[PDB]
Amino acid sequence: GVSGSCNIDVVCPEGDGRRDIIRAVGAYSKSGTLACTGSLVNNTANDRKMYFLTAHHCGMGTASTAASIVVYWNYQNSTCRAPNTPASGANGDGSMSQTQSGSTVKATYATSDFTLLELNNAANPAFNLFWAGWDRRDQNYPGAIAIHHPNVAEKRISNSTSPTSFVAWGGGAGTTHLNVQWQPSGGVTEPGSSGSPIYSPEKRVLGQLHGGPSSCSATGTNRSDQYGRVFTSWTGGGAAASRLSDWLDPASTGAQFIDGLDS
């Protein structure tokens, strides 16, 4: 696939130290057509349940559209293309043969823009999947890591080394979203990155991508994106079908944050 040249292949050194969470992220199609990004999340029972977080606005939060999902794992360029060179903006060499079809909806909620799916098939050992931790504490972070499929093309990583801030979707005062500022020549996100996770520096999911003004040519504060918060989604819309808590802490441990689980 093809995406902006400012984007960074995951096999690049920017991925060092992150090779676990890189394996949590997948691209998917909706009714046959490449659509959005999602990622695996761990839960307190540590049971490898195929909980796949994505964004509500991608339209997977109905029984019918969830059934149509095809997820493509390990879809990334074989070699590091140097960021901001035309090599990075050229068609990549990713494989799309590691797939699984079908899911059900566990919860969906428009305000913090989250859908939790459960994939029908248990993890194939050959796909070497990872279930990432999460952090639901009401706070900001000194930076953040995005792993995503821009234009639903080969997997990329984008780093933020600026503090996050709370916003409402659109950028007004609010607390439902995290605002993330990209580096001035670093990776960004692009259509199809929607639903992709944002991770704290400790590699725990904080939210999933709603959208925002970023592109490889964006300057200043337009080089940014907004992520629906796990904090907000935890309580969500006030019942199991519209929140994360029942699914991610089934053991009622009361955990504020957890780490990941390897396959």
From Swiss-Prot:
Annotated active site: 57 (charge relay system), 113 (charge relay system), 194 (charge relay system)
Cystine crosslinks: 6-216, 12-80, 36-58
Record PTM text: Three disulfide bonds are present.
Places the protein is found: Secreted
Similarity annotation: Belongs to the peptidase S1 family.
Domain text: The C-terminal extension has little effect on the function of API.
Protein name: Protease 1
Source organism of this protein record: Achromobacter lyticus
